[PDB]
């Protein structure tokens, strides 16, 4: 639960999420537009719809995020968030 | 400046930080305290004393967080320090 | 749901908690120890231990915190968003 | 004593109230801050925060002064705990509930 281990987890989840997106340009395009539009309103919707229509991608990304969600239980210290300011 | 690349770059930096912290136990402890205390003013003073007494780790960790600041500078994307906190919330899921 | 109104709500809730704690010395010291622990470790745990022994204080504090959770629903920000602002302030300080 | 949780709650409470008075009296700071609450602490709102503070160093200096009762408390007692720590503890109660 040490900072070294939070960082390592977030590092292997982020990387795997990365590889997956790289291999899935459509999804990679829709997440890309979200980051360009600062997670504003229009890009969130496009993303929601992309998940309804691609239940495999949604469950695959969910599986890749699991260790991160495990962690902030197994330790449960703050947001699964700002910890990743690094 | 694709999402895959920002996630990959978050992925390697965080990895590299974690390995750094694993081999630097006192610093591991000093960041662990900051995380388990929500970056309170106590944990900061002690991180500050730590960086001041250990300038090599301050620069080692700074060098490590570079590829992320470079990505933000290269891309005009959240990604980096101040911006990132807002970004991380909102990757709210 | 303006910032000024959340700030005022947070303002008056926090003050009512204070007056409350002021007249509940024992709850006052449990909370006090949690802050000094910097709100770490079994700060959740010692809170439960105190609330199991003291259901009326548990319930008194919930009622006093209503306006805040009420506003939190009425508007947004599941309280992690006030956190988020606080996190930014803290990293600017740092 | 004056370093108890009752006292920090009270201090937090006058800071927040007087921050509400300040925003109420500075609608462009209110606007930027409301947008941040409304947009859910988005990346964009934060850039607007920064630019707001940059075009208005008076605002950052005022904001600094409004929290000063906390820092004083912190030093008379030194927990220098923040609004955040206060929010932390609230979240800690909810989670216990």
UniProtKB/TrEMBL annotation, chain A:
It comes from the Bacteria. Transmembrane segments: none annotated. This is Haemophore haem-binding domain-containing protein. Residues 1-75 form the Haemophore haem-binding domain. GO terms for molecular function: heme binding. Disulfide bonds join 1-75. The chain holds residues 41 to 126 of 136 of the full protein. The lineage of its organism: Bacteria, Bacillati, Actinomycetota, Actinomycetes, Mycobacteriales. It comes from Mycobacterium tuberculosis (strain CDC 1551 / Oshkosh). One of its GO terms (biological process) is heme transport. One of its GO terms (cellular component) is extracellular region. Keywords: Signal.
